[PDB]
Amino acid sequence: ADGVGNASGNWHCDSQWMGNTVITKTTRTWVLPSYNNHIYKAITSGTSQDANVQYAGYSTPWGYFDFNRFHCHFSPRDWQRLINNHWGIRPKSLKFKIFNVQVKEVTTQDQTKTIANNLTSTIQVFTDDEHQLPYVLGSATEGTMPPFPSDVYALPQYGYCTMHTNQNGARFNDRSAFYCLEYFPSQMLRTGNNFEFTFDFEEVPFHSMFAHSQDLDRLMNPLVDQYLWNFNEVDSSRNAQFKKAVKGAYGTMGRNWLPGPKFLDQRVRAYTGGTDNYANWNIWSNGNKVNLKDRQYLLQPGPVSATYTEGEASSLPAQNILGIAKDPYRSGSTTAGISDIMVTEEQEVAPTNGVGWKPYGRTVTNEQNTTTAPTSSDLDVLGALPGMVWQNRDIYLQGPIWAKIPKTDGKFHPSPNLGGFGLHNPPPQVFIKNTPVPADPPVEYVHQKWNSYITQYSTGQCTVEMVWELRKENSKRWNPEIQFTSNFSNRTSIMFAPNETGGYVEDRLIGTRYLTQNL
Amino acid sequence: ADGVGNASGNWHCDSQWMGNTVITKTTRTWVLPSYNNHIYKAITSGTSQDANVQYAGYSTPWGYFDFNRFHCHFSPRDWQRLINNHWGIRPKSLKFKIFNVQVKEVTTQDQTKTIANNLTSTIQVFTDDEHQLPYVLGSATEGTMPPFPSDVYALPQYGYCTMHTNQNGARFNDRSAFYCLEYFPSQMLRTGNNFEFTFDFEEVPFHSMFAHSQDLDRLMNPLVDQYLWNFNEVDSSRNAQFKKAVKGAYGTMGRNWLPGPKFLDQRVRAYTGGTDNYANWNIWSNGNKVNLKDRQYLLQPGPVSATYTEGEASSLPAQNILGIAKDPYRSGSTTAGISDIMVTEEQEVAPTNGVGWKPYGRTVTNEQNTTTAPTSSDLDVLGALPGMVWQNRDIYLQGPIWAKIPKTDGKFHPSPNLGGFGLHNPPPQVFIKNTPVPADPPVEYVHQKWNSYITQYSTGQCTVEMVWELRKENSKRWNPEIQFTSNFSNRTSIMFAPNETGGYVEDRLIGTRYLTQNL
Amino acid sequence: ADGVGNASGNWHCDSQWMGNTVITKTTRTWVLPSYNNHIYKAITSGTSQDANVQYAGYSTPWGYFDFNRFHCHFSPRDWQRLINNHWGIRPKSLKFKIFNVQVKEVTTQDQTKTIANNLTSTIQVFTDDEHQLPYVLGSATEGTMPPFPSDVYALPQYGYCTMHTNQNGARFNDRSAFYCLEYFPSQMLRTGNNFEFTFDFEEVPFHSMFAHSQDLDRLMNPLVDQYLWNFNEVDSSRNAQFKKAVKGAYGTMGRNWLPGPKFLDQRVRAYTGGTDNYANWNIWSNGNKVNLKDRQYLLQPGPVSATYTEGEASSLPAQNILGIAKDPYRSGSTTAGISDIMVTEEQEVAPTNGVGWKPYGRTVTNEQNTTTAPTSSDLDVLGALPGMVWQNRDIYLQGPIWAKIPKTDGKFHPSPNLGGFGLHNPPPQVFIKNTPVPADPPVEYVHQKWNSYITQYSTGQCTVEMVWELRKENSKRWNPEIQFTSNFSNRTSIMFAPNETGGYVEDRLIGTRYLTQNL
């Protein structure tokens, strides 16, 4: 294909806007180590007796590419052009390349590393097109490409969980599956070789890049009464009374449509002002949980809900938020306060979704009679009922693009709770390993497992080219709308740029919902 | 197009039944005033501090046509032919005309009005085809065409609500949208000119014009046992016992299908007999409510439920009913009793839907053991679960035809709670205004807003032509069925006709569900 | 394209003279380090509180090529053929190549550097054709190619200034723009690869390579009187008197044309003889300045003016000169005297431009009457008035070729003050970087920014080929003209050649204006 002295690819980063489509291209330099030192390891939770944290699986010698966050594909300026001018976006097609491969050997002598080119060494690359391997993308995990184009990123090690059991610690059972990645055809690359593949997204709904400019309970003409007559009260004579729904009677009016279903969330005050928190409680005791088998885990974030009520504006739904550290590299060994963490604000869905820590509503709790007074209480948690409408969670420049829909007999509204595009056929996983280069063999043959290798690592460039379909904003609104703008003011470095020491700084989460549209 | 002395259209009222389709045509005389005196007004709830009743929006100089009730398009006799002979109906296409336009000027001198033709004055008409304006149809509000063909109807004024906030009264915010209707292309009509447009409905499910002749729990052959063995009890020895489901064991039988999901409603006795009401309580305190943002409002009517259990036949689900005044013009300033109000009766859905004030069922509340006895309670409110089946609300001659489905990421069974056809693309709103005719200008130019106008109003005729698709009744039932008939007996005027003073009288609600069909 | 063992280009240095065009070709060896160690740095003036020196911007990992001085493209002998034989020159087209690329790695062990070829490493090259990056060429800054063909030149690091504000030091604001150069498509080159592009200059005026042989006030025939009669005086009787402009009356004659507009400059005596200087004053206090925002800066050099009056021949306009060190590498840490600095002499423009420290002329300062005597003073600074004509600044073998015209709504005579060709579309900037080669990655994946790299640098050859359009000298002058010649006499090394230690010596500035032409 190509020799030692020719480049096998070129650098491509741009965004192209044509018609109803935008094409993003981005190139990175990647680094791949040799993981596990060329073996598979059965990994578990060990002696841990807590069923909730138990797991069983395998770490592999293979690495992988994760481009599943938007800021991989969009500059902040391009994200601005997207969210200010368009009502919708969905992924269409994908092209991925690996080129300019460099395999290197590391030799240590007397605490002295020397790095040299190994020109005859290979890397192996394959994509899993039929989704025959455990799919670890779409879990919102690190190891994604860094947003900034000149940043290098080490490829994460591939591993997976498989079925486990609880007896005196995690154990594999008969349903536990092992996957050898060397049991798949992969092409081998020396420095001259390159790799590419293409992918087409299935048809999915456009993400809704707008906020509603109307509330689900305001849909009627304010100037006219309804012709409906609703039950009002029972008179002292015990006879039922009916009241006409009249203009301004909004509490009593009959409606065709209901807010979407929700869990109840606990409210926390994350910002200055408003109703203050109770002290010394953790979400693990008091939060929403999911029972699965013998295990519990916190239900986070669940379907999206409105973030706050006005006047309570500093409060958050505890578990309904996506937190992201302002410093991507901040260590998770210690907790952080609100000042260190970017938290998503879902207020755009307030017209249809209801606020997280508000109950869905009230429910009648009894059947009344002459001697039984009517009673009612809160409806905290409610499933789907005919007439409900809701918005999905917003997508963020720093958030995940897609998630793989689990393969199941049934689903309800398969929109991922973390946000993004639910896909029956997500983009295939791209696996990469350094081909093992054995060390010096013994002169006299011995029967043993081969543990001796030359230390290798590889580096190169990768281009990701995505095509995005757009819905144009079409609106007769007379007055100006809300736009995302730079209101950062005076700074010691440019926002969404490198700082003095070269660290890339994105301290603000950016959603898509700025333009408005009627219900 | 046409002069002063030629009619621009003819009167058309008929119903045509051909094959699987019925075509309704109806003509009315309309009256349009000049609303707001040619200005837009920002309208709010004012100083009201109650968040529940707050709103913000605009009243417009424009009027509009609302034909969204069935009795606009169907005579009572045609409605009878529909409901006795057919299993289903859905709208197909729509044609609307405005013609024979007459613009008139009103001059008042010394408390004396004179009305004269203004031959050079215009009206403006446009339809909003792309649904770019706030859609106020489908809220079951007055200003619809009157059922009776020779009744004149004044066109209602168009207004809308837009996003508001709660601080010290209702306020507009940055998401609040203003819409100038003069920012749309509209054709202008003098007395010779006419207007028309056509519309096609999207494919929607046929309304179910039948009642089920079977109950969801009776579906099996009564002559045969099941081969299923269900858990029955635990013996005094603590061992589980299994009982065979045998013919007649209907309470214990395994089934494939579940009744539809429901809210629990409070029961009220609206008629003579049965269990009497508790005294002096109102639905606002005790009823089902919806939390939306910081607001509450009564959940009415919600998905349809069965109206009563037999022997309780006089009771109603409080909030699950559509009330309609027997006198359409009865003032809403005072409450009414059952004798003044027509209330819908949903008993046809009793086979699948369950009764409004009955809980869905019972639920086990605990995990038993040797020292823990099993407990259970009522399941009042339940969302959708696999295996549920239900009926939608019935449509009525006096009820709404369609509702606009809110534009949202997700929906569950988008059938409108008030009944009718949920539409992603409903029929477009038809807006009409009297073109402002300015009064005498000042001889010397002055810089000021122009407030001086000649008083105008317009009148004309409008034809609505709808095409309806039908499903023919196909049944092997041997015995006669239920039919809608005239059983009114002796009256001082014909029912569904004018009375002595010319008022049109429809005192009986008429559903579609008479014919029966098996589950 | 090419392997390890083949050259990807050849050495080209020549000048071709054909017809009205000259083609210059020149080749250099370049060296590129890795700047900033593969990061962008936000750079400011720091804690400096002086608004005049404040700045904000970015240094980039990229380098660039600057060939924007004439002695890059012309040997002294070719410059001689140009200026002695031609009246005009302008750039036409440009071709640039990068070839014979060598990427090398530096390894330090125990204070011992070893340099080795890295055969699989790349460089990245792109040109900014649409001028989408801050354009730093045309500011007369170092980092240009050295004149002498066998000299190697390190490529300068690319950086730029962006909008800043003054508050407690320089700050970035919302108008400050960051530019990632990796957000541009660039081709990647191994040792076999090469690069080229072509460019066409827009039509610009020929530089005027001649001096005028007439003065703007001598244009008339000396043998004939004018027929004009000019106001002369007012007699003791108060009546106005008119005097005929007669041959020899040059001070009183009417003329069609005016000298060009000018700032007033301060005169300094830079050479022996003439009127001596005042002592102990600096130009920062006493010089011409420009107010821009809250900042001041010295107005240098401004539009060109004549350098001196005869008899004052040792004086200079203080700020109107281009100084260039006779030693290009003399450090700027200390001031230099005239003997160390080559200073341009603009005397060729004396016919039309007026001398820098002379005022433009005299102006009447009052409106006289019987009791008010006429007064007048100096006109120091004057803008453009109808009838003015002027010459631009001369171009020098050691001076800049072009400058980018700022993109603005309006311009007056967009000829650069430093001299050369003002261009709306200047030659594109050529950016080059060493592709980062990552070092050994950690075996166990960690989430951190990648700071580990192998030290790289690159070298190669670059050819610049420019096409120049010429205007031929056409003159009927009988007597010989002024020519540029070698009058250096006896030297220890050849002038415009290397010295004993190999340093290239050009101690004399050479303008283009030798041939003469009438006004």
Author numbering:
A (entry chain I), B (entry chain A), C (entry chain J): 214 to 732
What does the paper say about this structure?
Goose parvovirus (GPV) is a member of Parvoviridae, a family of non-enveloped single-stranded DNA (ssDNA) viruses with T = 1 icosahedral capsids. Adeno-associated viruses (AAVs) are also in this genus, which are widely used as vectors for gene therapy applications. It is noteworthy to mention that few dependoparvoviruses, such as GPV and Muscovy duck parvovirus (MDPV), are pathogenic and do not require coinfection with a helper virus to replicate in host cells. On the other hand, the “right” ORF expresses the three capsid viral proteins (VPs), VP1 (81 kDa), VP2 (65 kDa), and VP3 (60 kDa), that assemble the icosahedral capsid, with VP3 being the major capsid protein. Goose parvovirus (GPV) is an etiological agent of Derzsy’s disease, afflicting geese and Muscovy ducks worldwide.
